[PDB]
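Retro notes
What went well: the complex prediction finally ran end to end.
Inputs used:
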Amino acid sequence: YMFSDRSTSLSIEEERFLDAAEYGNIPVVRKMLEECHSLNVNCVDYMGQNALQLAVANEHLEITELLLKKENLSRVGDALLLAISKGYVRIVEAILSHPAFAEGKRLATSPSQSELQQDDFYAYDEDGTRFSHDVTPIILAAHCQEYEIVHTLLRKGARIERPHDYFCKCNDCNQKQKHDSFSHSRSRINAYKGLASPAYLSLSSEDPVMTALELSNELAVLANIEKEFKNDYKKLSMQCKDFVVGLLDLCRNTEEVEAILNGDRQYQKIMKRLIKRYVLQAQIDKESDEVNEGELKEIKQDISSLRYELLEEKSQNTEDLAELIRELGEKL
Amino acid sequence: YMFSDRSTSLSIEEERFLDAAEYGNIPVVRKMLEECHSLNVNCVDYMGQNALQLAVANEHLEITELLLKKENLSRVGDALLLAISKGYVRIVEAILSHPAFAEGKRLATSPSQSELQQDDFYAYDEDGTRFSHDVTPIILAAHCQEYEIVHTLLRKGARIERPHDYFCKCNDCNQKQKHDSFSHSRSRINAYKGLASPAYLSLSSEDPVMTALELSNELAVLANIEKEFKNDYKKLSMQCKDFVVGLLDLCRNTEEVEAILNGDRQYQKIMKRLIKRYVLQAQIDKESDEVNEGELKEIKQDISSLRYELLEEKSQNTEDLAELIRELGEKL
Amino acid sequence: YMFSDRSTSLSIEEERFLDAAEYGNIPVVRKMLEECHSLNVNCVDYMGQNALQLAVANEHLEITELLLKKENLSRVGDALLLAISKGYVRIVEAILSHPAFAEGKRLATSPSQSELQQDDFYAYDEDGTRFSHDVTPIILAAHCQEYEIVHTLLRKGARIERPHDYFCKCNDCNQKQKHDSFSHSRSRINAYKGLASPAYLSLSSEDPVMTALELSNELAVLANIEKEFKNDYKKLSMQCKDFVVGLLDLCRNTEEVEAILNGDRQYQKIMKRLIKRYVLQAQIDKESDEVNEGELKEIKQDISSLRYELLEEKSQNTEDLAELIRELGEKL
Amino acid sequence: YMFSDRSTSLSIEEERFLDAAEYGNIPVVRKMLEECHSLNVNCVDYMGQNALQLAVANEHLEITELLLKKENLSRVGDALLLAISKGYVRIVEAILSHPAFAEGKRLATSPSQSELQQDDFYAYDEDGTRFSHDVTPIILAAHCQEYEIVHTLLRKGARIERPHDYFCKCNDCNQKQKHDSFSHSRSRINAYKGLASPAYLSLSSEDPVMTALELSNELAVLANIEKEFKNDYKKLSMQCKDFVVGLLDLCRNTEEVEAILNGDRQYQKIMKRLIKRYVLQAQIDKESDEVNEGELKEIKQDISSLRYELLEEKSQNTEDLAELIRELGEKL
């Protein structure tokens, strides 16, 4: 009558490996990755998550690099999605060095259809995604509003494609509408929430005030036309108006105020100054929010990882050294 | 006129051992457990708590394993109850390797009556329990709503037995009613709060929506019938309705919505997907609560434990090494 | 025009010593305490506080023990008051091993008058106290409501003496009234706030319900009689009523409820059980408050202390070892 | 279409150096500063910030001292402004040992005009300041209300010059008014907010009650006269009234109350006592605010810095030692 995902009982090797991957015990993971050639690294815990997922979820960077050194690894895309969703920057910039993300071939790609074609890349528990099918890395990065990850995914040449019209009549949109209505509406609202984020507006365009105003008007039209999610499509336009008002408020000089209120070389330079000012201001105001439990969980896990590394390092130190002095003590 | 539990004044050995067990000083606890054969490990502090209780209450895993290596230890069940009540996962999974919990013979057992028979296992200060007598580990795990501990205690084959009817007329229930009324009503409301937790509902049944609805109706009937705790029995049914509404809200596909709203292979697979989705969502929303003082207390105690371990380890390192180079310096 | 307490500019020795005492740099403090015989350990910072005060204020236990090894130290009583006011338990139990607190001769002593006689023990900046003159350690411990410190100061045989009547007519009270009115009223309200704390009520008497009720009635009489602080004297009686209601609420058995509501061997045992239950419950509810900045300041200072200790320890390690291998490399 | 400040793609040397400066990896920064003579230390990240700015923004003191050992460094004044704005005390007291702040020649200097003359000292991204041009270090220290930094900048002999009259008619004020109106009004309100801070009032004058009252009346006059920012000029006067009321509330003796309410040797001593009492009280009440995310970011970065230092130190330890025992093992 029990709910258990792992139907097969877990061996002692997989148990020590998964607790070591959960609590960042780096050197015994090195030992298990080297000496044990019967160690299935695609093992799952009681919930059904991989050692890479357990390593990413607790912010251990070193074991994530060490696991990415292996090549039989799976569910890497969901590890990237989880690291974006919690906002671990170095884990994202280490996962993006995997060969599956070499040319950007999986980051935000509409010609390789994620929802229509069973690509099966972003997946966990071989049965479904951790988010919607329409959610791609840069959409989730815009949803979580973390600026360094958005800039890294933009430097990889991945962007958010604007959704189609409310009645586009092309057979792709008609087929995606006919297969599921609620999923299609959720895809549209998720892509528009990704488009209306201050991170993507600040880092993706060249005239962010113009793009923000056009998006606000377009979201108001899709608000009053569409009946499902009729209020959230107005909240996104309110977020765009909030973004352009925050750009107005961060101006110091009267030249900056006139450059925003006019919009029209010099304008490119003053917009590149104001975008940087707004990014640093929003970074401070994200650093001035109250503290949730997950950050202390990260700190306690990093402390335990430090404990394991230092204890084993000094133990292997005294063994490797006392061997070489034992050779003396026997030799002399 | 002073209140003091330990009537006997504490020796210097017991003082150093209890401060070392309070602040996680691992190696001097190893030294006191080895070199001192007159060390009563059942010593109590000023409050009256054991070294195992002081070690569990501050989250020191290593000294908890080290104390469980000993065999004259007492009050292990209350250490398990305290580790469940604060939610230390590794301490629970290390305490459950003790031989008193080998076959599950003490976890959630109604044929071995905890309230009626003086089992005296879950006890502190030889005079009473840290909770009610009806509180067993999985009931407290459902009360604290921690999912990994509930899954571990369920894998041990322990479950919450449903309480009897409001007038069962069997002589066990009549005797437990005649011995104490307030204690019996508290036992009933504690067991029903354990049954209505989202952790036990999500991890214990096969059709959680059906069990949640049946429990909500049963709790509404026991709400309007019983006069004592007349509102809390409605709050539990409101929690069950909140649980089934949260399951409805976490659906993505229209197939998932239809699978919840109908209830009737494919349904087993879609329920095993939705239960995992709800578990991960509730884990995130538990990780998004504000921070209390006890977590920082845990972090400071782990930092002090790390300090003691590293300082003594490098000190014993330089002594063990400088001895072997002193043998040279005298020999050559 | 500048405000500066230290009129004499600070030498480089005193500067390195005071920054090392501020940030817990243990080994350079050992070096400065040993090799420098011209080091005035009563030096003050820019504010005017001693190295012991700076060491206590940031929770460094090791340098506090090291400074208490010295004997020319001053302002120890204010260090005890500061450690009580922030609630550092081990620093208090280490400061109470100083010879000035050997027999309890300074803890809570009315025959050695603190306000009338210029004892000059609890002092900083040679001009005044960090609190009122009537504030003694156990009064401040009752004000901060920390239970372990109250129990430690009670085991030292220090207690809070009840203030006199509103018109006592003894020449001591008349003289203390004639010297200052506002100071005398503040002394009375501070001593009554110390008497009405749940810590002192729970740890100081044998029948806490009777003492709490008598104190609540006495505080209501002094509320309606006295005009100055007319509402706070009612808030203390409300705190006493809150304490006895919390004792009523923590009862499990009907025997415990009847033992509270009656008050009259068996009653001594059941009160010693309920007092322990209330102490543990209030300790949990103190550990369930939100987090202030000072705890993170303590954690960051302990981290920096750990960094300094480990870095210097491994540096002195490699020097002490490489000397003894250099003797070889030159000898062979 | 991408927004990127660093138009030149970053080399692998600059990448390893900037990630090492971001996450406090001290020894590889030592290695890159020594062995690489083609390392442009004025490199910028994706945002456009220097290695000194990235090192200051995450509170790494050791790499900040190490970078200040170099002499081709730029944007030091904005590093000082950032360290003041986040309130890192040791980083400020280490940056003020740079030769650009030797005699106080850049701290708060009106004869060397910061807004009128293009001094280009406090700058980032070669295009603008992180704050207004009128913002100098002690004005920002008064804005952030951190007392140790205000005292350090006051001991450097830097002060806040009072702004001119609302119509001063001198050609400097007329020219600064004619060049920009909004910038001039922002400069006036920023300087008056710096003057009305409790830190500058408590640490800069000799009779703080008189200065606070004169400033409150002057700010009320500039409130009712000036139309722009008409309410904030009243909020500053309300802050001055709050400051003098807090000084009244912190009095213990009736002599202290009479010394405040009169204002008129003995008065100098009692004001020097009350100013110290208010400073310590405001320091406690700043340490009793809720916790934001940036403090945990500082703690996690210090933990990672400790990890890097200890791991490399023990690695270089075992290499340097095993070389000298290898010389033996080959020699004997």
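What we learned: Residues 181 and 187 of chain C are 10 Å apart (CA to CA).
What to try next: split runs per interface for comparison.
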